[PDB]
Structures are given as structure tokens and as C-alpha cells.
């Protein structure tokens, strides 16, 4: 026998979408071919993102996209997000944007198009830039979710600022002993 | 232990060290209208007997002495609670000890 | 079973060396400790204030904070299956500069100077250390003197 350990042999990663959506699987076929037959690493990143789950494909807001596309040298580049583009009602001026997204909210789409912008699907992006040249690959905030407030060190340990799980918030719900020096301790 | 009847210590109201009269704090009488006493009396009324634990397993033989300090400034009679360590015998303003003194025969 | 006393088992650990009791020499108070230098936590027992715990005696750390009489040291401690970096406040009597970092800084300065000089002189020189190589081939003269014959001695009962 050989002296090796087999507990890390199988790498845990998406090799395909768990989704049964046929349009998603079709453009997965398209970008699988593109990744295999081109040297571009953009295609590989896009394919692995297409495999991902919804929590790993967070929505990207219009404001965040505009802010990332306003950076110097990104003029006339295509903003590519593997996910949904969301309207942000906190912004008032929408510039002319060339955009490729898996999904676009109806209000975001109307705002982008009335601002003179252009919206593409991923097959159109493959026909436009097959190697992903002239693109800005964006992503929504991956940790912008409520669960990440509860993740981390336990709430009852020193120097932890993680939210606890409480059915209600109020002065009677997890505020006395272990939360203030007057009631035992605080940490 | 023995502590003098006066000491010059910090007064929070004045913001500086002032003389203070030192006395021994004694627990006041129960109000009978404190909310815990009211709840206890309501709970005890009726049938059911005793409804709260009765300790009856004492182990400590001493208490932490509490000194009641009062600022001697007439414009500031502010009081404070100072706790000293546990002692079996406590004296306030006793006679000072002497070093080169004969022990009484 | 064992007590949890802070100085349990330090009977020799915090004691002074033989005929080295008394007044602490003042160069120890004159040493300069900056942030980022490496110090060994000894833990002498003449001074009781600011004394490190026994698990830090013989450990080396990096200074991160300097106060009037003490320093803050980031020192690794192993707790079962994890190593974690503790921050301890130690008075300067219980630490001294680690000379491994001194030797390494000397070697870096030597390497930089030698590289700058070697580019100017033209030829190439070796900068990495290497492990002790196998011994070279050499000759051993006898100098006309026959090698001495060695014979194991008989056994005799000493005492």
C-alpha cells in the first residue's frame, strides 16, 4: 500500500449548473465551447460563474455598476455581470452604458435604454466579443446578505459583533445577563 | 480591622479630594411596597404554601464591611459606598497601635 | 488535581542564577525597544511587577507597543491543536533582544553590499548559504612515519 490520505481527493466545486433551466444550459454549452477553444480567461471566469448558485451570483445595482464604469479608462467598455441588474432609485442621472447581464429588472432596463444605453444577453456578448475584449467584469456584493451578520464568532464571546438569532427585538429579548456589566457581565 | 472616623478622599460631586466622615453602612428596612415584595406577597397569598426558596444553608461567617463616606463640605453632603475586605471584627475610630510599648501584664 | 496557581512549578524557572542575585544591572533598563523587533521573554524573578506567565518563559515574540516600563509582545502560544498569537505586557526586565534577528540583519546588509559591489566589479558571487557539502578529495601525507597500530586493551576489574 501507499502512504497517502484520500480525504481531499475529490475537489468540491460546481462542474455544471444545478439548475435545469434550458436557456441557461444552452448558453453554458456556448461558453463551455468558448472556454475550451479560446485561450481567454474571461470565458473561463464567465463559465464558472454560470455554474454558480444564486447566492453566489448576487444582484448588481445600477448605482454600483455606474460607479465601477465611471473609473478612468473604462469608457466605451461593456459591463458584464453574470446575474441580475437591479434598478437603484437612489440615483438620478443614468449615463450611456453598454451592458451584458443574465437578467435585467424591468425598471433598470427602461432606465438604461432611455439613457441611450444598450443591453445584451450572453449569446450576444459572445457574438460581439468572443474573447471578452473590452469588457469590465463586475459582480454584486457577495457578502451583502443577512446571513453574514450572523456568521462569525459567537455573539457571546468577547470582541464579537455578530447578530444573534432572536424571534423579536426589544428590551426584553437578550439584553440583560451577558450584555451589560450591571447584569453579571458584558464581554 | 480598624479605620479612622475621617479620611481625605475624592468626592465625585466636588471633583477633588475633600474630607469625609466615615460611618458603617447598615441595611435599611424593607419597604413592603417594593415591586419584588409586592409580587412575593401576592404569590404567597392563598393556598400553595411557600412559593420561593428559603436559603437556610449559610456558609460565610463574615460580611464585606461597607463604609459610608460623607463629604464634609456643607455645600456638598454627597455620600458614597466603599467596600473593604471581609473581616470578623471591625472597629471605627479605635485607638492607634504603638510599637515600642510594653504588653500589659 | 494540579492547582491553577500563576507561579506553580516556577521554583527554578523564576529563580536567579547562582551568585547572580541582588541589584539588577542598569544596561537592561538602558536597552531600546522599538516596534517590530524580536525579543526573548526570559522572566527574571527579582522583579515581580510585569512578570510574564510561565508559558512565555523561553518564547520569542515581536514588540508592538512601548510604554514607560513595559512593552507589548505578540508571542505565539500553542493551545492543543491551534497556535494563536497572544499579546502580553511585559516589563523590560524580563526581555532582551533576540540575536537571531541581529545576525539576519547583518547578513542582509552584507548581501546587499556584496551584490552592489559585485555588479560593479563585474563577476558573479554566491549569496545563498548552502548546507555543508561532502568533503573534497585530498591527500594525507605520512611524513615517513608509519601510522600507529591500535589494539584493544584487555579487561581488568577496576574496583
Amino acid at each position: 500500500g501507499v502512504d497517502i490520505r484520500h480525504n481531499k481527493d475529490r475537489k468540491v466545486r460546481r462542474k455544471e449548473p444545478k439548475s435545469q433551466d434550458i436557456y441557461l444550459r444552452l448558453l453554458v454549452k456556448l461558453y463551455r465551447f468558448l472556454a475550451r477553444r479560446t485561450n481567454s480567461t474571461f470565458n473561463q471566469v464567465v463559465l464558472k460563474r454560470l455554474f454558480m448558485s444564486r447566492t453566489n451570483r448576487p444582484p448588481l445595482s445600477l448605482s454600483r455598476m455606474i460607479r465601477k464604469m465611471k473609473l478612468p479608462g473604462r469608457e466605451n467598455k461593456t459591463a458584464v455581470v453574470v446575474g441580475t441588474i437591479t434598478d437603484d432609485v437612489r440615483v438620478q442621472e443614468v449615463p450611456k452604458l453598454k451592458v451584458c447581464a443574465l437578467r435585467v429588472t424591468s425598471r433598470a432596463r427602461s432606465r438604461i435604454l432611455r439613457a441611450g444605453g444598450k443591453i445584451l444577453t450572453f449569446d450576444q456578448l459572445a457574438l460581439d466579443s468572443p474573447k471578452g475584449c473590452g469588457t469590465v467584469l463586475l459582480s454584486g456584493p457577495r457578502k451583502g446578505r443577512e446571513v453574514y451578520r450572523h456568521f462569525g464568532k459567537a455573539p457571546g464571546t468577547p470582541h464579537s459583533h455578530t447578530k444573534p438569532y432572536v424571534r423579536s427585538k426589544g428590551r426584553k429579548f437578550e439584553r440583560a445577563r451577558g450584555r451589560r456589566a450591571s447584569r453579571g457581565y458584558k464581554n | 480591622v480598624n479605620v479612622p472616623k475621617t479620611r481625605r478622599t475624592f468626592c465625585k460631586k466636588c471633583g477633588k479630594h475633600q474630607p469625609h466622615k466615615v460611618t458603617q453602612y447598615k441595611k435599611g428596612k424593607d419597604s413592603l411596597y417594593a415591586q419584588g415584595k409586592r409580587r412575593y406577597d401576592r404569590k404567597q397569598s392563598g393556598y400553595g404554601g411557600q412559593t420561593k426558596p428559603i436559603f437556610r444553608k449559610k456558609a460565610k461567617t463574615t460580611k464585606k464591611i461597607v463604609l459610608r463616606l460623607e463629604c464634609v463640605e456643607p455645600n456638598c453632603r454627597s455620600k458614597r459606598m466603599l467596600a473593604i475586605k471581609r473581616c470578623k471584627h471591625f472597629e471605627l475610630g479605635g485607638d492607634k497601635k504603638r510599637k515600642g510599648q510594653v504588653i500589659q501584664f | 488535581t494540579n492547582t491553577k496557581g500563576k507561579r506553580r512549578g516556577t521554583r527554578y524557572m523564576f529563580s536567579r542564577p547562582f551568585r547572580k542575585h541582588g541589584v539588577v544591572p542598569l544596561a537592561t533598563y538602558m536597552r531600546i525597544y522599538k516596534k517590530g523587533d524580536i525579543v526573548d521573554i526570559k522572566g527574571m524573578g527579582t522583579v515581580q511587577k510585569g512578570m510574564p506567565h510561565k508559558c512565555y518563559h523561553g518564547k520569542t515574540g515581536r514588540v508592538y507597543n512601548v510604554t514607560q516600563h513595559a512593552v507589548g509582545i505578540v508571542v505565539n502560544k500553542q493551545v492543543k491543536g491551534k497556535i494563536l498569537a497572544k499579546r502580553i505586557n511585559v516589563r523590560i526586565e524580563h526581555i532582551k533582544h533576540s540575536k537571531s534577528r541581529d545576525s539576519f540583519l547583518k547578513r542582509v546588509k552584507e548581501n546587499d553590499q556584496k551584490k552592489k559591489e559585485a555588479k560593479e566589479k563585474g563577476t558573479w558571487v554566491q549569496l545563498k548559504r548552502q548546507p555543508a557539502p561532502p568533503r573534497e578529495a585530498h591527500f594525507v601525507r605520512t611524513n615517513g612515519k608509519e601510522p600507529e597500530l591500535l589494539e584493544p586493551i584487555p579487561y581488568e576489574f577496576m574496583a
Binding site: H150, A154, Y165, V166, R167 | - | -
Partner: protein, 53 residues
């Protein structure tokens, strides 16, 4: 017993709740019955407004 992180839960199922359970399988029948009664009342008060005063 609590298991790792969680929410302290207080279910109100200590009181023989299974004897008092109100199923709603008669909800579509009740909607039909009320609708028919409304239609009959509207027919009864023939020109008067159906909803009432």
C-alpha cells in the same frame, strides 16, 4: 437540547392542541354559500342598492 447556534424557540403546543384544530376544507363551500346569499338578498331587495344603506 440546543444544538450550536439557533433561535430560542417557544412553541405553544403544550396544551392538547390536537383536539382543537380548525381545518378550512369548507372554505370554498363557505364562499359559495355567502355568494349565493348575497345574490338572493340582492334579488329580494330588487331595485334597492345591493350593498345596503
Amino acid at each position: 437540547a440546543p444544538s450550536r447556534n439557533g433561535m430560542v424557540l417557544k412553541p405553544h403546543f403544550h396544551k392538547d392542541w390536537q383536539r382543537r384544530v380548525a381545518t378550512w376544507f369548507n372554505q370554498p363551500a363557505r364562499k359559495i354559500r355567502r355568494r349565493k346569499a348575497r345574490q338572493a338578498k340582492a334579488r329580494r331587495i330588487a331595485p334597492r342598492p345591493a350593498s345596503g344603506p
